[PDB]
Design an enzyme around this catalytic site. Structure first.
Site, PDB file in Angstrom:
ATOM      1  N   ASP A  57     -34.461  53.016 -55.008  1.00 42.07           N
ATOM      2  CA  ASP A  57     -35.110  52.017 -54.178  1.00 42.07           C
ATOM      3  C   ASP A  57     -34.890  52.192 -52.676  1.00 42.07           C
ATOM      4  O   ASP A  57     -33.773  52.028 -52.173  1.00 42.07           O
ATOM      5  CB  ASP A  57     -34.653  50.639 -54.630  1.00 42.07           C
ATOM      6  CG  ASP A  57     -35.552  49.559 -54.144  1.00 42.07           C
ATOM      7  OD1 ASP A  57     -36.687  49.458 -54.658  1.00 42.07           O
ATOM      8  OD2 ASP A  57     -35.111  48.819 -53.249  1.00 42.07           O
ATOM      9  N   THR A  90     -41.462  50.373 -50.037  1.00 41.98           N
ATOM     10  CA  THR A  90     -40.513  50.444 -48.928  1.00 41.98           C
ATOM     11  C   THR A  90     -40.264  51.887 -48.458  1.00 41.98           C
ATOM     12  O   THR A  90     -40.200  52.155 -47.265  1.00 41.98           O
ATOM     13  CB  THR A  90     -39.191  49.720 -49.244  1.00 41.98           C
ATOM     14  OG1 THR A  90     -38.485  50.392 -50.292  1.00 41.98           O
ATOM     15  CG2 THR A  90     -39.465  48.288 -49.665  1.00 41.98           C
ATOM     16  N   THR A  91     -40.131  52.823 -49.384  1.00 46.74           N
ATOM     17  CA  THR A  91     -39.998  54.215 -48.968  1.00 46.74           C
ATOM     18  C   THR A  91     -41.232  54.664 -48.180  1.00 46.74           C
ATOM     19  O   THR A  91     -41.127  55.222 -47.082  1.00 46.74           O
ATOM     20  CB  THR A  91     -39.794  55.137 -50.162  1.00 46.74           C
ATOM     21  OG1 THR A  91     -38.557  54.798 -50.789  1.00 46.74           O
ATOM     22  CG2 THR A  91     -39.760  56.620 -49.711  1.00 46.74           C
ATOM     23  N   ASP A 383     -39.791  45.471 -58.507  1.00 45.04           N
ATOM     24  CA  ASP A 383     -40.887  46.175 -57.847  1.00 45.04           C
ATOM     25  C   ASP A 383     -42.178  45.794 -58.549  1.00 45.04           C
ATOM     26  O   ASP A 383     -43.154  45.432 -57.909  1.00 45.04           O
ATOM     27  CB  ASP A 383     -40.745  47.699 -57.957  1.00 45.04           C
ATOM     28  CG  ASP A 383     -39.668  48.282 -57.046  1.00 45.04           C
ATOM     29  OD1 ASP A 383     -39.082  47.541 -56.223  1.00 45.04           O
ATOM     30  OD2 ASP A 383     -39.410  49.511 -57.172  1.00 45.04           O
TER      31      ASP A 383
HETATM   32  N1  LIG Z   1     -48.641  58.948 -61.585  1.00 47.94           N
HETATM   33  C1  LIG Z   1     -48.571  59.147 -60.256  1.00 47.94           C
HETATM   34  N2  LIG Z   1     -49.071  60.268 -59.688  1.00 47.94           N
HETATM   35  C2  LIG Z   1     -49.002  60.462 -58.355  1.00 47.94           C
HETATM   36  N3  LIG Z   1     -48.446  59.581 -57.495  1.00 47.94           N
HETATM   37  C3  LIG Z   1     -47.915  58.418 -57.945  1.00 47.94           C
HETATM   38  C4  LIG Z   1     -47.945  58.129 -59.385  1.00 47.94           C
HETATM   39  N4  LIG Z   1     -47.354  56.932 -59.551  1.00 47.94           N
HETATM   40  C5  LIG Z   1     -46.975  56.490 -58.318  1.00 47.94           C
HETATM   41  N5  LIG Z   1     -47.306  57.383 -57.366  1.00 47.94           N
HETATM   42  C6  LIG Z   1     -47.091  57.283 -55.903  1.00 47.94           C
HETATM   43  O1  LIG Z   1     -45.719  57.189 -55.497  1.00 47.94           O
HETATM   44  C7  LIG Z   1     -45.665  56.415 -54.294  1.00 47.94           C
HETATM   45  C8  LIG Z   1     -44.650  55.289 -54.458  1.00 47.94           C
HETATM   46  O2  LIG Z   1     -43.461  55.912 -54.937  1.00 47.94           O
HETATM   47  P1  LIG Z   1     -42.043  55.164 -54.900  1.00 47.94           P
HETATM   48  O3  LIG Z   1     -41.021  56.228 -55.214  1.00 47.94           O
HETATM   49  O4  LIG Z   1     -42.081  53.912 -55.739  1.00 47.94           O
HETATM   50  O5  LIG Z   1     -41.960  54.776 -53.323  1.00 47.94           O
HETATM   51  P2  LIG Z   1     -42.108  53.323 -52.605  1.00 47.94           P
HETATM   52  O6  LIG Z   1     -40.681  52.822 -52.445  1.00 47.94           O
HETATM   53  O7  LIG Z   1     -42.736  53.651 -51.270  1.00 47.94           O
HETATM   54  O8  LIG Z   1     -43.025  52.503 -53.506  1.00 47.94           O
HETATM   55  C9  LIG Z   1     -47.058  55.868 -54.041  1.00 47.94           C
HETATM   56  O9  LIG Z   1     -47.686  56.661 -53.026  1.00 47.94           O
HETATM   57  C10 LIG Z   1     -47.804  56.066 -55.340  1.00 47.94           C
HETATM   58  O10 LIG Z   1     -49.170  56.367 -55.054  1.00 47.94           O
HETATM   59 MG   LIG Z   2     -42.192  51.885 -55.498  1.00 44.86          MG
END
Ligand SMILES: Nc1ncnc2c1ncn2[C@@H]1O[C@H](COP(=O)(O)OP(=O)(O)O)[C@@H](O)[C@H]1O
Ligand SMILES: [Mg+2]
Ligand SMILES: Nc1ncnc2c1ncn2[C@@H]1O[C@H](COP(=O)(O)OP(=O)(O)O)[C@@H](O)[C@H]1O
Ligand SMILES: Nc1ncnc2c1ncn2[C@@H]1O[C@H](COP(=O)(O)OP(=O)(O)O)[C@@H](O)[C@H]1O
Ligand SMILES: [Mg+2]
Ligand SMILES: [Mg+2]
Lengths: 516, 516, 516, 47
Positions: A57, A90-91, A383
């Site tokens: 996170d 958040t990332t 989340d």
């Molecule tokens: N199956 C998937 N294929 C490609 N990208 C994905 C998939 N699932 C989620 N994402 C991408 O990962 C990013 C969010 O990742 P995450 O590690 O949860 O970061 P954050 O803390 O920013 O939400 C988003 O850009 C989302 O589009």
């Molecule tokens: Mg996320």
């Protein structure tokens, strides 16, 4: 002699200020980049007490490090606001801010003036908000299939993703259950309980609440079905007057007479409760040991000294009114639950109030084998709860996987065309910056960012697919929407706005004056 | 239990190694950036003993700072090599290197691999050397007018700027006089002498040498016209044998016989000196007080214990042979000078050997009001001697004022077109890096670098004036060759090659391991 | 990451570098301002050992305070060069420099760029040099009346001005006596001796030299009139061969044979001296006890172990040649003096060699009541020797009392009118700067600088009196040349050039890097 | 880099554990051995 400005003071002017702010920004973003997306990795943080946090996170990582650097702290606010307003991304928000600073440096190192950059960024950001509205798809608040994809997309890449499908259905049911009569979602109405157990798969949804209490007397029923629930915040003790009062006894007969009066009014309180029809009672204050006995005799289950928070959850769940005067207690103030039961759960005694029909508050009981495994499942659950809530409230979603950032980037470059002068450099720079998302997603998946970005762009070119993004597993570009990789519009609108505003603020700085 | 790598060791890997070297490089470059060009500014450096250097000179500034950082040390040697091989263009080389590092960072942030930027840089550098050869103009080794422009271009932007016309002519005469039979120029044959005086304008060329000595006896002439100069490597003293020898006297009358034998050997030595036709003598070793007298008697000017380095230049200037045995001295070993004179310059007694007919060593007497003013004139003269020397040796020059860098950038971008894949980015980045020179020249002049560059490039576009550059005074792009702003080819070839080679070396580093 | 620039380092950039240099310069000027002119005051400097200097002398003041600030040190070099090249005007040079820095700051503060200031300063300074040549008056090297006014002007305002008429006359005779064949004046030829006495007015010129020695045997005459002086730089002892020599004695009768041969070698050496006609003898080395007897028998006055510096002035004053072998001495090596006398002065016995006919060296014997009073008198004599020497060498003088600075200032403003651009501001600033001299002369006299400035300019306006300056006593403006207030052209040309050059140098600095 | 087991910890394994317990035991026993029986002797302990 002597000095005008304080002697114990660090200062950084012009290029040096720009540098330390930009640098601190970039390094904060680099810290969490690798946590991004399906192939994201986790961090182990150890504090000065030796307590450990293991998480993917973004905002949790940034809060737990002890960042002191002032420009870094400005960017951590980007993550905190993302967490408050949306609960996800958040990332992303922080990584975009980091890239906005990086992009701005190349402009500053060309003698483009800071105000021009800030102006271009503001214009690009504003255009971006307009473009996101046309890019977004509408969804209905009752579209459980889409809500479920929203939740699954959120949990993907987390750890709990092994139990993704069951978790997501639970989450969607949980959030749907607390939507209020204006169609708003208060995530506080979903109580989270974390209990070790046999596996993450044992996580369940409880239509009602878990109270960490035991009934006050072993003589009371341990279990009661279709219970009629009284909620009191007055203590079931002998009532004292507010005005200072004292008893004077001159006749040794009146000794026992006052004693017997006190215990009759006590027996009267219990009889007033019995009369409402209640067979389960939760009292926020204390209950007299004698009242306990009477209550036990009348077959009424009761817990004392219940924290207000639970009282309030109980009201929401069972539909009872928290009553403040025993005299005023009515059967219409009683709540209803399918089952009230004192159970041990992992060696912990608790009172389950479950199987309420249309509960306005509910409880997710999260299971897992170890404390730390459960901690991270719970963050993933938060989340997902956040994004399901956004979707129900806004009714707007976009495709994920970097698809939306690419469409956004491409449209913003079109817009840059019609900007005159240097400001155009900055608008393009903002456009380029958004691609950090698709690029990072690919990097973390061990793929070549440059070439995949070329493919994904070409799939957007012309009237292409706004939903085209890179599938990190296959390596193909695909319609992210059709693959159910979707996110609430609010994730992107908030992340981009936050990134823009905080970087504009940082780029306006030409002078850093640190004390001590 | 024990550590494998030393425990007292800081280590920086991957992105962190790259970031520290790139940063150390960029910071080193930007310290000297503001010294560049006609409108460059100077630095005052104060060492830990309180001594001060004020200078415009890039390599001097870099050595005087006591840089400790390892990567910074690496590109400081770019400055030292430039100084050693060319004598000018030391900030240009370092500023190019820093910009090559900055442009590489941009490439690494897009996941271009380091070995690929290195490969592209090598290709661009090699093309650059090829383009430089075709760009250069041929000039003759004795084209005084062009050599004068070469020196003047060198002195522009220093304190000594005000007197650059007189200085350049002196410098061109000085260097042309020491050119050897192979057409080579040895800077060391131009003795630099620094003396306080009325003005920078009092600086003068001496066809001969200044000796930090007085004649050994005040009875000797202090002025000789058309001097015949003897140069002795031995002491004019009683010669003792290498084998240990001792005198035994048993007869009192033998006392005087020996004393008088020694006294005669001395008189014989002086007699042999007089016979060669010598009327001036410089002796590397001692001259016996008694011999001094006889030399004075014979009207011969003499100086004793001259420095060996002085003997050498005297020989070079007057055409005398340094002789090691008085008996061997012949008229043919004598040199000639139009004027030998003992006189005082700014309070100091010196022997001037001047108006030599075809000196092979020569002296430049630099004058100035104060010591530090004079120091900086000397540094300027040094630059000018270097470039006039390069021009004489190489017979090749290019126009200056950043005109050649723009021509290079433009041509390199054409070259990059036909380069496939990712390496193309590196080659374009190298091309963009070279424009740091015209860009820095404009910005030091308070001009807008972006618009300046647009105009200069347009003047190079198609065909296209390879000499077009920005006049930082008028603000017009003009033919720099027509304006006499020119420098030796060797300045650019050395600067670009070392900047490329050193940054390639740094870009190959993925691991920094620092002890203690 | 490690730091790139060393961490012990203080650094002042742009406006801060300018400010510290400008300020340090100004503060240096302000410490000596109050010493300027006939109403100037003195400083008492005490060093860390408790030793005391009191003086009006600008360069002496600046040397004695142990100034460590780097920009201050550069201005002090201005005073040191003034002292070396001219010998007077050291406060003037530094005060003009300080004002030039002050006027530049006003131009910097309204955004004139430093290179434009220095370009304007260089232009005004060059113009000022050529104006000064037209302002100067021609004077003959043998015009004693004018040299006397030169010396008197120099001495005005110093402790010693009470004795300024006899002093000046003495100094004019002293300097005139040592003018060489080329018409040059070496100050080192005027020996300064300082001895407590009844009064400053007991100071006298000796046409000869004072030797801190006693005759080696009391049996020698203490007085010799019409002396013939022998100068030996070889000892008068038994001469030892250069090659090692040992007597071997087998006959006891040889003991005495050698002993006697050695004292015959002594008589002989003395008899050679007497044969030359010498009645006085100065030896650089020792004189055998027995030689001292023989010498005394022959009535020859001998001093032994005379400083080589003494020998040299003895030769220059008397016409004698320092001889290296007693075997060489002849009537023609002998010097002449009207009187050689050993006598007590301040209870110290010394040898006076005086009443020489054509001395090429002479001695000012400075008298005064206390050591410190005497020190200051000698400093004033030095100044006057410098200016008298300059006038003799240059034949060019100007009027004093700030009249020449006002003339120069007025003409420079005229010049400035024809200057187009921002450089006009700098030329005007330089013009105004020069007025710090008439303004300071008047401040120190407690007059109103602004008002008197209006008056002096008015007298220079039209084609009025270039020689008009303020009489700090009278309070009126008058012809300073007529009042005999005059100074060598060289005082002004050197002071203005040094101030110009060192401040142009400081104004070029945009960055100060101080280690430790 | 960091130790897994606490760094301020002494450990004795196999033969070494056996030897220390056996020794500590034997030494304890032999302190009181001389008190045994009709002819046993006493100890003076000072705290
Ligand atoms: N199956 C998937 N294929 C490609 N990208 C994905 C998939 N699932 C989620 N994402 C991408 O990962 C990013 C969010 O990742 P995450 O590690 O949860 O970061 P954050 O803390 O920013 O939400 C988003 O850009 C989302 O589009
Ligand atoms: Mg996320
Ligand atoms: N009159 C001029 N106009 C424009 N540029 C000039 C002029 N004279 C010199 N230059 C440029 O200034 C640069 C060199 O400046 P300098 O401060 O000496 O740096 P370096 O130490 O690298 O030689 C070169 O590009 C040279 O062509
Ligand atoms: N009688 C006088 N009236 C007015 N000014 C004088 C007189 N005598 C000397 N001055 C001025 O005093 C200045 C020199 O003062 P001084 O304290 O010796 O400073 P510096 O060390 O710079 O020579 C000169 O400008 C000179 O013209
Ligand atoms: Mg140069
Ligand atoms: Mg003076």
């Amino acid at each position: 002699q002597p000095g005008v400005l304080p002697e114990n003071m660090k200062r950084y002017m012009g290029r040096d200020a720009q540098r330390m702010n930009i640098l601190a920004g970039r390094i904060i973003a680099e810290t969490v980049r690798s946590t991004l997306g399906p192939k994201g990795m986790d961090k182990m943080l150890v504090d000065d007490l030796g307590d450990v946090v293991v998480t993917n996170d973004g905002v949790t990582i940034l809060r737990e490090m002890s960042v002191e650097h002032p420009a870094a702290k400005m960017l951590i606010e980007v993550a905190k606001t993302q967490e408050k307003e949306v609960g996800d991304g958040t990332t992303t928000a922080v990584v975009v801010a980091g890239e906005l600073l990086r992009k701005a440096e190349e402009l500053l190192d060309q003698n483009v003036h800071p105000t021009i950059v800030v102006k271009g960024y503001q214009a690009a950001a504003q255009k971006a908000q307009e473009l996101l509205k046309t890019i977004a798809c509408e969804v209905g608040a009752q579209d459980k299939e889409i809500l479920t994809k929203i939740a699954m997309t959120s949990i993907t890449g987390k750890g709990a993703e092994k139990a993704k499908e069951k978790l997501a259905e639970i989450i969607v049911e949980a959030v749907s259950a607390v939507v209020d009569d204006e169609g708003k979602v208060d995530k506080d109405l979903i109580k989270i309980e974390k209990k070790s157990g046999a596996s993450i798969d044992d996580t369940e949804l409880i239509k009602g609440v878990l109270v960490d209490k035991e009934r006050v007397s072993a003589q009371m029923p341990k279990k009661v079905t279709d219970a009629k629930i009284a909620l009191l915040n007055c203590a079931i003790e002998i009532k004292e007057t507010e005005t200072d009062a004292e008893i004077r006894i001159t006749d040794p007969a009146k000794l026992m007479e006052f004693i017997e009066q006190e215990e009759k009014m006590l027996k009267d309180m219990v009889a007033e409760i019995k009369a409402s029809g209640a067979n389960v009672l939760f009292c926020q204050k204390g209950i007299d040991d004698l009242a306990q006995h009477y209550l036990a005799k009348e077959g009424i289950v009761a817990a004392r000294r219940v924290k207000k928070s639970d009282m309030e959850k109980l009201a929401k769940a069972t539909g009872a009114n928290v009553i403040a005067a025993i005299a005023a207690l009515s059967a219409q103030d009683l709540g209803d639950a399918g089952l009230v039961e004192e159970r041990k759960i992992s060696g912990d005694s608790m009172i389950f109030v479950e199987e309420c029909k249309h509960p306005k508050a509910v409880t997710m009981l999260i299971r897992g084998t170890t404390e730390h495994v459960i901690e991270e499942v719970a963050r993933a659950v938060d989340d997902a709860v956040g994004v399901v809530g956004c979707t129900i409230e806004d009714g707007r979603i976009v495709s994920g996987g970097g698809s939306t950032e690419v469409e956004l980037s491409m449209k913003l470059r079109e817009y840059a065309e019609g900007i005159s002068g240097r400001e155009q450099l900055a608008v393009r720079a903002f456009a380029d910056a958004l691609e950090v998302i698709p690029r990072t997603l690919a990097e973390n998946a061990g793929l070549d960012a440059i070439e995949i970005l070329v493919k994904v762009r070409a799939a957007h070119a012309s009237n292409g697919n706004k939903c085209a993004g890179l599938n990190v597993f296959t390596g193909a570009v695909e319609d992210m929407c059709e693959n159910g990789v979707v996110e609430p519009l609010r994730v992107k609108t908030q992340a981009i706005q936050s990134a823009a505003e905080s970087t504009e603020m940082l780029l306006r700085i030409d002078d850093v004056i640190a004390a001590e």
